[PDB]
Amino acid sequence: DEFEMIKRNTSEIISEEELREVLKKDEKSASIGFEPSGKIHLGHYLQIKKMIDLQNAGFDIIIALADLHAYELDEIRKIGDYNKKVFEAMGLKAKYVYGSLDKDYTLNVYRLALKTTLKRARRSMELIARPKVAEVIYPIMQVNGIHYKGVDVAVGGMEQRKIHMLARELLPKKVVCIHNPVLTGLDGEGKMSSSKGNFIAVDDSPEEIRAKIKKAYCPAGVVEGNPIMEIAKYFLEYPLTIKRPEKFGGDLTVNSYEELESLFKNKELHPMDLKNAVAEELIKILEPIRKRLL
Amino acid sequence: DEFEMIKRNTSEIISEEELREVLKKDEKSASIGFEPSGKIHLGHYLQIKKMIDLQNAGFDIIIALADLHAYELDEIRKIGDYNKKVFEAMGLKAKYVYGSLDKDYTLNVYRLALKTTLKRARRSMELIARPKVAEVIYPIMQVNGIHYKGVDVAVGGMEQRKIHMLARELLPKKVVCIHNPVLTGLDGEGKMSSSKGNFIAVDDSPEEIRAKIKKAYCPAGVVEGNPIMEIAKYFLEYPLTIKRPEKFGGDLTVNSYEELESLFKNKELHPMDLKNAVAEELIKILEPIRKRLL
């Protein structure tokens, strides 16, 4: 089912019913924005896979390259083109836009500012709510950068939701907003970030994938905040066979993450064995993508 | 003396001391911004006269035509060039600049906004300081639109004083600010306004100038908020001969406005005589300008 395919593994969909109605149009666009990253990791990949879900539903995909660090990009500029290679290599075909800031720019920005109120604008800020005028204007500038220029759907992590909630109030365009979960990093602290070695870059070698996974936070029986279980949920295909030592009961067949979840919850699956599986499966899954470097 | 000629009839000079230093420079420029106006009246003329004072001291004069009603392209630009002909007719030859909206534009505002704070921004507002986000951003946008791009001196009315003092806090280069008084309108309420019949337009006919001055607010003995006294101060030459019937004391010669101020304040000069002198002198003064109509 196309709707269910889009919903699978999302945190929320503003206007579910709205999304359905969007699906009926022949021509339909989705955007997502990524701040360019020196490394593309599983966090990025989780999103692209969602864009790919939409692509498969006949969405025209738009990827906005987000430099709002305009406060150099002769340097940022093809970290962008590189990311582009990676998204192409993950099998995503889309049209690219970047920060550019044409003449009509300040006009609509101010028009949005006419509508938002200081109380409203403050609600919209991240948690260093506490003030410079830049901090109050910024979110309206972010709302403007949303590629709503004819898109029916906008996608992003749950961390963007405050802004997304604003954009829905402010835009002449009612846009469906789609949130992906955020991956926990390997060390079990915050979100997967290309810092703390808690990331898996989609281009890591087998040796490295194994190494990083071996060190990762994975408490036995525990599923919340378990990054190895997250990787299992978001990336792997089922049924899945887990190879194991005889002292731990030999090969184990899971037909779904739900079946796997209970098996770990009851400590029928040890972390050592779960990590070993996720490593090998992940390797197989990134390997075709990694191979798109001649 | 160059400094004293500049100071004459100004309400204030930020850094009288700083202005002295500027006068010593070999090359110096000065700007003013005007909202394009259908009618050019004595309020405009008072400023233009002050720019001419600066021009005579070896300043290059720059006039910015200020369209910040961008929230049309066509209507605004030509009302401007008609104004331009009027300033030329007043004997001002200057360099003109118009509202644009650059690539660098929003970048420059935001740097300003970074530095400005909510409380400060509020202080700078008209007193519907009391709120949409546009209200808070507006001041920074005005600041940016002070063409300070390389001027030593900026000029404007006292109504602009809140923003000019903010601009002094915020701009990278300290610009000297010079403020001209606000002319009271003919009916004696607010500033001279091209409406309510309380203006004298630079191209008004003798009969019209006479009519408007005849009905103008001028209580005997009273100097504050007396628009007729103001016109006498800012526009007339002394010694000034006031024509009168012999029955009303005959012709009268006043050597300075101060002498004239005391004459009126002690009711030794009648309003009806004062209006007639201001009207008749004003006509002689404006006639050459009026006639520069192609």
Curated annotation (Swiss-Prot), chains A, B:
Protein name, entry field: Tyrosine--tRNA ligase
Family: Belongs to the class-I aminoacyl-tRNA synthetase family. TyrS type 3 subfamily.
Ranges where the record places region Tyrosine: 138-145
Ligand binding (L-tyrosine): S31, E35, Q160
Lineage: superkingdom: Archaea
Subunit: Homodimer.
Keyword field: Aminoacyl-tRNA synthetase, ATP-binding, Cytoplasm, Ligase, Nucleotide-binding, Protein biosynthesis
Annotated region (Interaction with t-RNA), positions in chain: 215-218, 270-275
One of the GO biological process terms: tyrosyl-tRNA aminoacylation
Keyword Membrane: no
Gene3D superfamilies given in the database record: HUPs (3.40.50.620), Tyrosyl-Transfer RNA Synthetase (1.10.240.10)
Reported impact of D273R: Decreases the rate of aminoacylation with wild-type tRNA and increases aminoacylation with amber suppressor tRNA 8-fold. Decreases affinity for wild-type tRNA and increases affinity for amber suppressor tRNA
Compartments, record wording: Cytoplasm
Main localisation: cytoplasm
GO cellular component: cytoplasm
Family matches, as InterPro entries: aa-tRNA-synth_I_CS, aa-tRNA-synth_Ic, Rossmann-like_a/b/a_fold, Tyr-tRNA-ligase, Tyr-tRNA-ligase_3, Tyr-tRNA-ligase_arc/euk-type, Tyr-tRNA_synthase
UniProt cross-references to NCBIfam families, sorted A to Z: PRK08560.1 (NF006330), tyrS (TIGR00234)
Catalytic activity: tRNA(Tyr) + L-tyrosine + ATP = L-tyrosyl-tRNA(Tyr) + AMP + diphosphate + H(+)
Placement of sequence motif 'HIGH' region: 36-44
UniProt organism field: Methanocaldococcus jannaschii (strain ATCC 43067 / DSM 2661 / JAL-1 / JCM 10045 / NBRC 100440) (Methanococcus jannaschii)
